[PDB]
């Protein structure tokens, strides 16, 4: 059993989002498919589910009026629609199917969620795609240095150092969302003070949505 | 609505130790339909126990579930490195399924004070009309720490944001980055930029600063 979800989406406040979940393996029509979301740094929240064969939906009261869950047996695909979106709906949305007892996947259903999709990040925002500025955090036994990756949208950004050769003592921080609705993150590394004259440190920043690929050399 | 309470929300334990995690329900859970999930950062959750005490074949037998009614327990007989993660309980004994708020099992280690570093804004950034000052609190334990920014000794509010890394897999510490952001014009009105750090490992606050 594999559940594969549609890709990340950015949605304006007040709009509606549809996320899909295509299942392969087991039996689509007679096992219960649910949707569970997780807002950044927060817990899991069950939203609702569907049993396709009967068309039987079951929505958490908190989303009853905003959510529609549908299932297309001809493609083994389930759909979450969430309406009237607000920034607090920014989250990773997971589809999850109940497990079956024993080996294989035609056993008696267990209710609990054994099979999970990869998640779909839905970002609710009025911001437009923007690539970051990349600024050095120059170094003043041990020195710290880094890069500030400022004012980008949407997530994600990846950072490596020295094209992946440098990983010891690297700390790349979770982004923060500024008042502007743009993200900022930092990445730092600690190194021996004596390496600063001889060794080169380069932060490799990649923001795919804006095609911003910067290899910033950071020096004293 | 059944409220599921997982308390404490964090447990600091050592590798090899036993862990018992509590899930208490506001009302009796129908037919003991109580599941436990593990979740690691960046990953989907994974089912460990269903029906209070049943374990799917693939799940390590060091995990066990017990209890009934309103009082459930996940036991990890001996913590492996990979067991340091977040654990959620879930009830599905009525049509409204609910989850607890999660318990993070983290690695206990010796107290470590942060090494603190302050970084002025780059010349490149200043050219563009904005100034960000960054304070790094590196490799501390436990996770609780506070950063206050002071500008010519005035406590700042509303112009900084911070974030924290996941516990490091090798040394079991945390690090924290805070950025103070001002317009260039406002940055240039002041002299001393300071970040003041409080942590269990420090007998009094540590300040790093620079005079622009």
């Amino acid at each position: 059993v594999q559940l594969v979800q549609s890709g990340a989406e950015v949605k304006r406040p007040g709009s509606s989002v549809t996320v899909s979940c295509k299942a392969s393996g087991g039996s689509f029509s007679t096992y219960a498919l649910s949707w569970v979301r997780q807002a950044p740094g927060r817990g899991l929240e069950w939203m609702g589910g569907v049993i396709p064969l009967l068309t039987i939906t079951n929505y958490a009261p908190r989303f009853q009026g905003r959510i529609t869950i549908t299932a297309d047996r001809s493609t083994s695909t389930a759909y979450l629609e969430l309406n009237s979106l607000r920034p607090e709906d920014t989250a990773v949305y997971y589809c999850a199917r109940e497990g079956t007892t024993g080996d294989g996947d035609l056993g008696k259903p267990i209710g609990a969620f054994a099979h999970w999709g990869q998640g779909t990040l839905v970002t609710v925002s009025s911001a437009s795609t923007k690539g970051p500025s990349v600024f050095p955090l120059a170094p003043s036994g041990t020195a710290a240095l880094g890069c500030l990756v400022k004012d980008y949208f949407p997530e994600p950004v990846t950072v490596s150092w020295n094209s992946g050769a440098l990983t010891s003592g690297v700390h790349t921080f979770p982004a923060v969302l500024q008042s502007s609705g743009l993200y900022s993150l930092s990445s730092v590394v600690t190194v021996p003070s004596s390496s600063l004259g001889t060794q080169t440190y380069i932060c490799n920043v990649n923001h795919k949505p804006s095609n911003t690929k910067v290899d910033k050399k950071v020096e004293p | 609505e059944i409220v599921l309470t997982q308390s404490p929300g964090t447990q600091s334990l050592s590798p090899g130790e036993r862990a018992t995690l509590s899930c208490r329900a506001s009302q009796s859970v129908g037919n003991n339909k109580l599941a436990w999930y593990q979740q690691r950062p960046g990953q989907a959750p994974r089912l460990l126990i269903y029906g209070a005490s049943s374990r799917p074949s693939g799940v390590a037998d060091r995990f066990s579930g017990s209890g009934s009614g309103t009082d459930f327990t996940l036991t990890i007989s001996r913590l492996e490195p990979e067991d340091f993660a977040v654990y959620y309980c879930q009830q599905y004994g009525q049509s409204l399924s609910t989850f607890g708020q999660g318990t993070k099992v983290e690695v206990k280690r010796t107290v470590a004070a942060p090494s603190v570093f302050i970084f002025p804004p780059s010349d490149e950034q200043l050219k563009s009309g904005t100034a960000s000052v960054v304070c790094l609190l590196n490799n501390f334990y436990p996770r609780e720490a506070k950063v206050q920014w002071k500008v010519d000794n005035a406590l700042q509010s509303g112009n900084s944001q911070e974030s924290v890394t996941e516990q490091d897999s090798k040394d079991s510490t945390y690090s924290l980055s805070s950025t103070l952001t001002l317009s260039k014009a406002d940055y240039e009105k002041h002299k001393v930029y300071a970040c003041e750090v409080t942590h269990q490992g420090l007998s009094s606050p540590v300040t790093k600063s620079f005079n622009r």
Binding site: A32, I51, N58, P109, G111 | -
Partner: peptide, 13 residues
């Protein structure tokens, strides 16, 4: 309980 439905479906199939 909606979470018991598929169990009934299984048993009758």
């Amino acid at each position: 309980n909606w979470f018991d439905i598929t169990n009934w479906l299984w048993y009758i199939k």
